[PDB]
Each structure stands twice: as structure tokens, then as C-alpha cells.
């Protein structure tokens, strides 16, 4: 058993009030009140982020932890926050975005956010059975939370296997992907094997809620994986009992128009 396993048990043991105070204490939160209503009313001419995912990828890029370029694939694009971020980047030439859609899942939001014309959205696509194709940058933000840590571990293992398949097709591609449950030993083993062949490392974005242990793997950073995970678990465990709220910041606005 790991510290993150204990974190997950302590999380599930929270009362409702305990859970909601813990969830958001100390985290960066974009201000989505304008964005939310524009999406709700169906405004397509907008550059405000279509989801909270945009600011997370923006943070990874601005830190230099990912370098989005060339032909980008977005595996599990959901509403498209990563696809629109990538399409607005001058070094990106095109985005192929894929998501399952269906009941309980987000379909792509269609807006004129800068570079939208460079995105080819395909909904109703399962990426886990899709044949990989050429890409310079491979992005994947898949990993659905579960109260069951073993399910979160297996969901995470499937994402890492997917990234191995896309690296097999594209050994030189940069990769960035969500690791939902890095605290699980089957996940650590798979991350080690990936890191040994492809390099890379783990990082926590300051926008992730304390109710998830998610971290992001990128081929462009480094770091011992176990220590990265353990630092994050201790930091998550140390926030239990904190009552401070979130730090609110402006939402990303990419502007509108074609590229």
C-alpha cells in the first residue's frame, strides 16, 4: 500500500462537508462565469476556453513542460479544450481530435477559437481500438475518476498502453498524457517501462482538484517517478483540514479566427 492509496481511503472517508472543503482548498480555478453562459446559449464566436482543460495544457506549455508542434493528435478530446489550445499555437500545423461521445460523455464544443479550422473533430471514436497514425505531438487527457482505486488504476494502465502504441508508431513524437492514478503499483510499473524507453516525467498542475491524484506525464521533462508521486501524495494528505478556498484566476481567452 502507498501513501496515495491511503489518500484515496481518507478521501472516501470524508463527510460531505469535509469532502467539499477539501476538494478546492488552495487550488487555482479559472473564472468561467462568462464562458459557461456563452457555451450554454450556443454562441459559436468565442475564444474563451470551452473547458477547464485549456488552462492546464497552457500551464504545461508555458512552463516548458510540453512543446506542442507539427501534426497534433488529441486522444479523448471531450469538449475540445486541449484541441483548441493546440490549434492556437503557431508551431502547430494541424490537430486530429478524437472522442467517444455518447451517453454521459462530452461531445466537442464547436467554436471559432483561433485556429479552429486546423482541427478535424471525430466524435463517436474509441481511441483504444483505433490504429495509430503519423503524428508529431500525441496528447491524451483520458482518465475518468472512480471511488474504486483499482478501477482508477486500470483506467490509467489503459492510457499508458495507448501511449506505448502511439510511441511505437511515432518513436520521435512528443507525448503528454493524463495519469489518473499514479499512486497504484501497476501504474508505477507501466510508467517506469515507458520512462525507460522514451524518457519523460510527471508533474502536477495547480488547477487539478485535491479530490483527484491526477498528474501529467510529458516526454519533455524528467524526474524519478516514485518520488514525484510521493511528494504529491504527501501534499494531498497535508491539505486535509485546510479550509482556505480556491485562488480564482482569469480564464484563458485564445481569441477567434482562422489560421
Ligand X SMILES: Nc1ncnc2c1ncn2[C@@H]1O[C@H](CSCC[C@H](N)C(=O)O)[C@@H](O)[C@H]1O
Ligand Y SMILES: [C]O[C]1[C](OP([O])(=O)O[C][C]2O[C](N3[C]=NC4=C3N=C([N])[N]C4=O)[C]([O])[C]2[O])[C]([C]OP([O])(=O)OP([O])(=O)OP([O])(=O)O[C][C]2O[C](N3=[C]N([C])C4=C3N=C([N])[N]C4=O)[C]([O])[C]2[O])O[C]1N1[C]=NC2=C1N=[C]N=C2[N]
Contacting residue, 147, 171, 241, 250, with ligand Y by CB under 6 A: 147
**Does 120 sit near ligand X (CB under 6 A)?**
no
Tell the residue number behind the cell numbers 470551452, with chain if given.
50
Output the smallest distance, CB 150 to ligand Y, in A.
9
**Does 156 sit near ligand X (CB under 6 A)?**
no
Output the smallest distance, CB 220 to ligand X, in A.
18
Note whether 73 and 135 are within 8 A (CB): yes
Output the smallest distance, CB 87 to ligand X, in A.
12
**Does 80 sit near ligand X (CB under 6 A)?**
yes
In this structure, the strands spanning 215-218 and 201-203 are: antiparallel
The alpha carbon of residue 61 and the mean position of all alpha carbons in its chain are separated, in whole angstroms, by 13
Q: Tell me whether residue 126 is annotated as binding.
A: yes
Contacts of 84 (CB under 8 A, 6+ apart): 49, 50, 54, 111, 113, 115, 116, 119, 254
* Vertex 158 angle, CA 153 and 159, to 5°: 100
Contacting residue, 7, 22, 59, 82, with ligand X by CB under 6 A: 82
**For residues 4 and 132, which CB has a smaller minimum distance to ligand Y in the complex?**
4
Output the smallest distance, CB 7 to ligand X, in A.
22
**Does 16 sit near ligand Y (CB under 6 A)?**
yes
**For residues 52 and 167, which CB has a smaller minimum distance to ligand X in the complex?**
52
* Vertex 125 angle, CA 119 and 131, to 5°: 90
**Does 35 sit near ligand X (CB under 6 A)?**
no
Q: Tell me whether residue 24 is annotated as binding.
A: no
Q: Tell me whether residue 231 is annotated as binding.
A: no
**Does 53 sit near ligand X (CB under 6 A)?**
yes
Cα end-to-end span (Å), the chain: 50
**3-state SS, residue 178:** strand
Cα dist from 194 to 79, 80, 87, 162, 230, whole Å: 28, 26, 27, 11, 19
Alpha helices by DSSP H, the chain? 3-13, 16-24, 33-41, 53-62, 81-87, 149-169, 185-198, 225-237
Contacting residue, 2, 67, 112, 145, with ligand Y by CB under 6 A: 145
**Does 59 sit near ligand X (CB under 6 A)?**
no
**Does 211 sit near ligand Y (CB under 6 A)?**
yes
Site residues for ligand X per CB under 6 A: 51, 53-54, 76-82, 98-100, 105-106, 125-128, 141-142
Binding residues for S-adenosyl-L-methionine: 51, 81-82, 105-106, 126-127
Binding site for GMP: which residues?
8, 16, 23
Amino acid at each position: 500500500m502507498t501513501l496515495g492509496d491511503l489518500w484515496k481511503r481518507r478521501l472516501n472517508n470524508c463527510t460531505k462537508e469535509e469532502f467539499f472543503a477539501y476538494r478546492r482548498t488552495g487550488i487555482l480555478e479559472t473564472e468561467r462565469d462568462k464562458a459557461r453562459e456563452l457555451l450554454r446559449k450556443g454562441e459559436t464566436n468565442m475564444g474563451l476556453a470551452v473547458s477547464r482543460g485549456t488552462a492546464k495544457l497552457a500551464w504545461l506549455e508555458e512552463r516548458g513542460y510540453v512543446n506542442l508542434k507539427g501534426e497534433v493528435v488529441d486522444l479523448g478530446c471531450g469538449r475540445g479544450g486541449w484541441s483548441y489550445y493546440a490549434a492556437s499555437r503557431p508551431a502547430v500545423m494541424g490537430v486530429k481530435a478524437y472522442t467517444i461521445g455518447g451517453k454521459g460523455h462530452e461531445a466537442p464544443k464547436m467554436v471559432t477559437s483561433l485556429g479552429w479550422n486546423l482541427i478535424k473533430f471525430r466524435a463517436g471514436m474509441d481511441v483504444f481500438t483505433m490504429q495509430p497514425h503519423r503524428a508529431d505531438t500525441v496528447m491524451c487527457d483520458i482518465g475518468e475518476s472512480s471511488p474504486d482505486a483499482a478501477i482508477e488504476g486500470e483506467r490509467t494502465r489503459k492510457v499508458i498502453l495507448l501511449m506505448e502504441q502511439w510511441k511505437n508508431r511515432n518513436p520521435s513524437a512528443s507525448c503528454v498524457f493524463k495519469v489518473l492514478a499514479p499512486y497504484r503499483p501497476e501504474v508505477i510499473e507501466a510508467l517506469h517501462r515507458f520512462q525507460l524507453q522514451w524518457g519523460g516525467g510527471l508533474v502536477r498542475t495547480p488547477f487539478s482538484r485535491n479530490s483527484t491524484h491526477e498528474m501529467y506525464y510529458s516526454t519533455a521533462i524528467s524526474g524519478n517517478i516514485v518520488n514525484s508521486v510521493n511528494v504529491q501524495s504527501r501534499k494531498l494528505l497535508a491539505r486535509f483540514g485546510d479550509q482556505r478556498g480556491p485562488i480564482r484566476v482569469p480564464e484563458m481567452d485564445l481569441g477567434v479566427g482562422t489560421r
